[PDB]
């Protein structure tokens, strides 16, 4: 289950 | 004229490039006065916009695929969900702290403390501690009186022994509030008609221990009422807090208005009440005496938090105005003595909350 937020 | 409250505009979110279409209950969250999160779709990409209230000029946008974002009250820790998928991220650490997959969609959630997220499903209420390997724990089953309500709030007392779930619905062409108050120690629910509520800690003179108070406001067909009630057995040695019931005035042209938000100042022992259509009321927590009413605006303030700096209330309206209201510490005692002509209340409040002006009654 992928991250619901993406960081730099 | 002197006013017993002070207004302050902190921000216009449209000056930060926030689209007014995203300034609403389901897309903008303000879980404390430290952050505002707004979910926006820019092109194809769902983003979250995070406003640091200590650095409001520099909102940071991050791509998301969450249906809901709520920032921790104190830390740049964010709770994200998409259906049954819950994730907690430390934003500064770019790291996933925790995850859980519910067996029911979460229709409402919020931070109830520095370390706990409350989750509301169609049929139950859960607490989720951020400590260690804690998973959500069911606190109680939802009462049938809230079935098919829009859930608009959930609050607890300081010790998380009294839990209050609030829903609204259309009935007889008015917005009717349905509350469930749950005792954690007694495992009993009480259905209550109510629109807005808060708990508060209050030490009565002559008492060694604080009392736990439950304050709620309702527009019934009975009219506007505010109730201030001690919950749970008084601590041993304490005198019980006497129950208060007072009227909540709605003018004739606001026949469709109703309370939406309550914050209690523990510094001033006052209750701030906001109505859907922009009336502000101030009540004394000890007696329920109405100190002041006025209109902020026509505008719906749709989210509120405590304002830590001023012991007040901060909110956002549909325009994107971030507005606070607090006690005016220099004017409230003169206002109660002279304008309200209540030297009794004035003198009580002056010594109780260490304010100036009851030298001259």
């Amino acid at each position: 289950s992928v991250d619901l937020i993406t960081f730099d | 004229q002197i006013l017993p409250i002070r207004f302050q505009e902190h921000l216009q979110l449209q000056n930060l490039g926030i689209n007014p279409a995203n300034i609403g209950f389901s897309t903008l969250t303000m879980e404390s006065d430290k952050f505002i999160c707004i979910r926006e779709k820019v092109g194809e990409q769902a983003q979250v916009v995070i406003i640091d209230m200590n650095d409001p000029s520099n909102p940071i946008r991050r791509p998301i695929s969450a249906d809901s974002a709520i920032m921790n009250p104190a830390s740049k820790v964010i709770a994200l969900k998409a259906g049954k998928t819950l994730q907690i991220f430390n934003i500064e650490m770019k790291s996933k702290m925790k995850a859980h997959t519910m067996t029911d969609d979460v229709t409402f959630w919020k931070w109830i403390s520095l370390n706990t997220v409350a989750l509301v499903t169609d049929n139950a209420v859960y607490h989720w501690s951020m400590e260690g390997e804690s998973q959500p724990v069911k606190m109680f089953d939802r009462h049938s009186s809230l079935a098919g309500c829009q859930i608009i709030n959930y609050r607890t007392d300081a010790k998380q022994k009294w839990l209050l779930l609030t829903g609204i619905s259309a009935q007889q062409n008015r917005v009717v509030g349905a509350m469930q108050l749950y005792s954690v120690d007694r495992k009993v629910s009480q259905p209550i008609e109510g629109h807005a509520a808060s708990f508060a800690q209050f030490k009565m003179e002559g008492n060694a221990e604080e009392s736990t108070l439950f304050c709620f406001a309702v527009r019934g067909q009975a009219g506007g009422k505010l109730h201030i009630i001690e919950v749970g057995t008084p601590p041993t040695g304490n005198q019980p807090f006497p129950k208060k019931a007072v009227d909540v005035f709605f003018p004739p042209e606001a026949q469709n208005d109703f309370p939406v938000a309550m914050q209690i100042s523990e510094k001033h022992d006052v209750v701030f009440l906001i109505t859907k259509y922009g009336y502000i009321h101030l009540y004394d927590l000890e007696t329920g005496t109405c100190i002041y009413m006025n209109r902020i605006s026509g505008e719906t303030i749709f989210v509120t938090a405590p304002h830590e700096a001023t012991a007040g209330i901060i909110g956002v309206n549909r325009k994107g105005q971030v507005l606070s209201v607090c006690v005016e510490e220099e004017n409230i005692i003169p206002y109660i003595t002279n304008v309200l002509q209540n030297p009794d209340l004035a003198l009580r409040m002056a010594v109780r909350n260490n304010l100036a002006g009851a030298e001259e009654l």
Side-chain angles (χ1 to χ4, degrees):
Chain A
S1 189
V2 299
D3 288 355
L4 291 180
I5 191 164
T6 309
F7 303 106
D8 192 25
Chain B
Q1 178 52 228
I2 77 176
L3 300 174
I5 66 183
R6 185 166 70 251
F7 293 100
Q8 188 178 351
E9 177 174 292
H10 297 261
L11 260 179
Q12 290 284 349
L13 300 178
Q14 298 194 56
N15 298 342
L16 286 165
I18 313 300
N19 192 326
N22 302 313
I23 307 182
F25 183 60
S26 72
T27 57
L28 184 158
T29 57
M30 187 175 66
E31 296 288 303
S32 75
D33 61 9
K34 293 199 161 32
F35 301 96
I36 297 172
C37 295
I38 311 106
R39 299 191 293 105
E40 304 204 293
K41 184 182 230 301
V42 301
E44 293 296 79
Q45 187 53 56
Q47 306 186 321
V48 65
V49 183
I50 299 166
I51 304 173
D52 191 331
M53 292 309 279
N54 285 324
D55 187 4
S57 264
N58 316 317
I60 71 220
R61 321 189 147 244
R62 303 219 174 67
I64 61 169
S65 62
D67 70 41
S68 181
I70 49 166
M71 196 73 49
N72 185 267
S75 193
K76 283 177 79 103
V77 167
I78 195 160
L80 295 174
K81 64 178 181 71
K84 291 159 205 251
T85 303
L86 318 188
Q87 293 175 354
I88 311 290
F89 291 80
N90 184 310
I91 284 160
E92 297 158 321
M93 293 175 57
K94 298 175 199 199
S95 167
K96 183 157 82 192
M97 297 168 60
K98 318 183 93 161
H100 179 83
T101 303
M102 298 295 282
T103 49
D104 295 301
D105 285 356
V106 174
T107 58
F108 173 98
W109 67 343
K110 72 174 280 193
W111 294 92
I112 56 163
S113 76
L114 293 184
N115 65 19
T116 303
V117 175
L119 315 164
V120 184
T121 62
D122 190 62
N123 59 25
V125 175
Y126 303 87
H127 289 183
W128 190 16
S129 171
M130 297 297 105
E131 306 220 290
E133 291 147 312
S134 299
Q135 51 168 45
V137 285
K138 187 210 203 68
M139 301 306 296
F140 58 93
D141 300 292
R142 276 179 64 168
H143 194 283
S144 49
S145 63
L146 273 69
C149 291
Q150 182 193 13
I151 301 300
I152 60 162
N153 220 341
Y154 176 73
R155 314 193 81 164
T156 84
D157 69 320
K159 290 203 209 71
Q160 295 181 4
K161 289 312 183 77
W162 297 88
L163 313 183
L164 183 87
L165 182 59
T166 307
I168 60 179
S169 64
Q171 262 131 53
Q172 325 304 312
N173 244 62
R174 59 179 203 102
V175 177
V176 176
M179 301 185 322
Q180 174 178 5
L181 175 72
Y182 182 73
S183 181
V184 169
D185 292 334
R186 308 178 189 180
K187 297 214 167 66
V188 168
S189 281
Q190 183 167 348
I192 305 173
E193 194 186 1
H195 280 119
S198 185
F199 298 86
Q201 294 298 115
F202 180 81
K203 193 165 76 196
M204 293 168 66
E205 304 308 339
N207 277 1
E209 298 298 308
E210 290 181 343
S211 317
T212 303
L213 309 183
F214 172 45
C215 184
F216 80 95
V218 60
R219 197 172 193 172
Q221 290 205 315
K225 291 294 175 168
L226 182 103
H227 293 279
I228 304 168
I229 311 157
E230 189 175 24
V231 284
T233 309
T236 321
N238 266 20
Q239 298 301 309
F241 182 86
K243 162 180 30 164
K244 310 309 191 308
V246 305
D247 288 333
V248 174
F249 177 80
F250 300 91
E253 60 274 24
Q255 70 277 46
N256 297 326
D257 202 16
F258 61 94
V260 297
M262 177 182 295
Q263 298 297 343
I264 299 172
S265 176
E266 303 226 321
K267 197 178 182 217
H268 297 124
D269 290 316
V270 301
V271 183
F272 300 90
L273 192 74
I274 299 186
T275 74
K276 178 72 166 188
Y277 293 105
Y279 297 76
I280 176 75
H281 305 203
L282 192 66
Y283 302 81
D284 171 41
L285 178 60
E286 181 161 20
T287 61
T289 309
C290 188
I291 301 175
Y292 187 78
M293 301 182 286
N294 194 31
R295 198 140 189 207
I296 296 165
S297 174
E299 286 260 32
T300 73
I301 298 147
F302 64 87
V303 70
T304 68
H307 194 219
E308 196 164 58
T310 66
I313 184 166
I314 183 155
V316 190
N317 69 15
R318 295 291 308 275
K319 171 161 197 236
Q321 184 196 73
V322 181
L323 178 86
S324 70
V325 197
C326 61
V327 165
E328 177 48 77
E329 290 198 316
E330 290 184 322
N331 302 359
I332 183 154
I333 303 304
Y335 179 91
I336 294 164
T337 309
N338 305 333
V339 185
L340 263 206
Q341 244 125 40
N342 193 338
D344 232 73
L345 180 61
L347 177 56
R348 174 50 178 153
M349 287 190 42
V351 300
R352 187 177 72 189
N353 310 109
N354 177 223
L355 297 154
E359 293 80 48
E360 299 304 309
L361 302 164

